[PDB]
């Protein structure tokens, strides 16, 4: 087995090629796979730059630049804490809302498509084993 | 089922926290994830920045600076390409491939450490149905 280091290197390959065929297919909604995850994020709740920044894994500047950008378009808004003023949120708006959700069906059908080969009943199963994997990494890394 | 979309955001969520754990673990080697690739690249032969910039989804910068990083340590060399000397590519050296070695046995172990709630039995099947995936995925983004 060179099976177990085989699995992580195609997870590798896979998510740097739905990276990219995601911010091909985002671009019809003027966003960046980035800008995807950040009203993913925000949909979820007000989130801080330096939580968007970690949680993505990418440099603030980043964030910044996504952040701009879909406040630009008035997907987010960023808003000052109620407990302490000083710390700014960055808020999704209803039309954020409304895009994310068409961004969501983009994703959807690539997913589809990728995973086409597979029946439901593979999908579940390897979703639960993959779900294995995260668990166990997510508490190593953190 | 929300379950293939899932499937592939949940290989996104690994992908990033494996890079981010293979980052740390790799600095034992003084060696980034990125440095990583780069010889695992060119183990395969000999490549120029463009290919591995390409291939690894990153910017021609983070190709230089990694090829520097391993230049500097001796892992690897640029040499111009015989048929046309113009043309630069990027070649690991025999402490390159033992560089490798070690980083591949970190890897490995890693590997291990989060997959070890699947059996050889599941990883197989596992492997073999997100393999699948990656051929799809493969084709369509490029």
Redesign the interface.
Same mark, same amino acid.
């Given at each position: 087995?060179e099976? %177990?280091?085989?699995?992580?290197s195609?997870? /590798?390959?896979? $998510? %740097? /090629?739905?990276? %990219? +065929?995601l911010n %091909?297919r985002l671009g019809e909604l003027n966003l960046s796979y980035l800008d995807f995850l950040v009203l993913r994020a925000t949909s979820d709740g007000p989130k801080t730059m330096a939580y968007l920044a970690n949680r $993505?894994?990418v440099t603030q500047s980043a964030i910044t630049a996504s952040v701009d950008k879909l406040e630009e378009m008035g997907l987010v808004v960023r808003v000052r804490d109620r407990e302490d003023r000083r710390k700014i949120l960055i808020e999704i708006t209803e039309k954020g809302l409304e895009t994310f959700n068409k961004g969501?069906e983009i $994703?959807?059908k690539? /997913?589809?498509?990728?995973?086409?080969?597979?029946s +439901?009943d593979?999908?579940? &199963?390897? &979703?639960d084993?993959?779900?294995?994997? &995260?668990k166990?990494? +997510?508490e190593?890394?953190?």
């Open positions: 087995n099976n %177990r280091i085989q699995i992580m195609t997870i /590798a390959k896979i $998510y %740097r /090629a739905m990276s %990219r +065929e %091909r $993505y894994f969501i $994703y959807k690539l /997913a589809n498509e990728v995973t086409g080969d597979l +439901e593979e999908v579940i &199963l390897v &979703l084993k993959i779900s294995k994997i &995260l166990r990494i +997510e190593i890394s953190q």
